[PDB]
Amino acid sequence: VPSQKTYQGSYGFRLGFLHSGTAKSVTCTYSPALNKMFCQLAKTCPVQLWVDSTPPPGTRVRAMAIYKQSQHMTEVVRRCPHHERCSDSDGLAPPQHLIRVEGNLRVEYLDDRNTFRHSVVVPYEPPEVGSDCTTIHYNYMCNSSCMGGMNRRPILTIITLEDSSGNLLGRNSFEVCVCACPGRDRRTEEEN
């Protein structure tokens, strides 16, 4: 099981999210109280990277999903049969991978040779104009409810900052629910 231990590191690495609210039309919304993102399948999911100092050239940013519950933590998070056989390929992402990155031609996908885990990595770039952070647009390609997949089992997304040689620079994580109505689901899970 990959580490989900938070680690800000030398560069003061922390995660952020748009303050999107919970309207019916929201694609992606983050709950600070739950540390949990609610998002629609295949829709854009802004995840912000915040640093106290800019990492060196050649830095990469990796994302991986693992199951939250200890009794599923060794099971590899992957797309359901129905979705992995869907005709939604972009030509880059393997069909079995839950998490894609949209709008980045330098995206890299990895099936771990030993753990069999899936992950997706992009070059870290410095903050764009108008932002104090760097935004990556993720897409989750399976619903949490999906049969033969997650089957309503909650997952975390682990975001690691690593240098060009593989060394760990930083790590954070947030819970995800991929669902039809993110705004409503967020309100409900906070209502408890």
Residue 15 in the binding site for Zn ion (CB under 5 A): no
Distance in Å, CB of 150 to Zn ion, minimum: 8
Give the CA angle between residues 18, 20, 25 to the nearest 5°: 135
Confirm or deny that 177 is annotated as ligand binding. Answer: no
Query: Side by side, which strands form the sheet with 45-50?
Result: 14-16, 45-50, 134-140, 99-101
| Binding of Zn ion by 60 (CB under 5 A) | no
DSSP code per residue over 41-72: TTS-EEEEEE-SSPPPTT-EEEEEEEESSGGG
In whole angstroms, how close is the CB of 192 to Zn ion at the nearest point?
26
Contact 118, 64 (CB under 8 A): yes
The pattern of x and - marking residues 74 through 103 that bind Zn ion according to CB under 5 A reads ------x--x--------------------
Pick from 49, 146, 155, 158 the residue near Zn ion by CB under 5 A.
146
- Residue 70 near residue 159 (C-beta atoms within 8 A): no
177 binds Zn ion (CB under 5 A): no
Q: Among residues 98 and 169, whose Cβ is nearest to Zn ion? A: 98
Report in angstroms how near the CB of residue 148 gets to Zn ion at its nearest.
Answer: 7
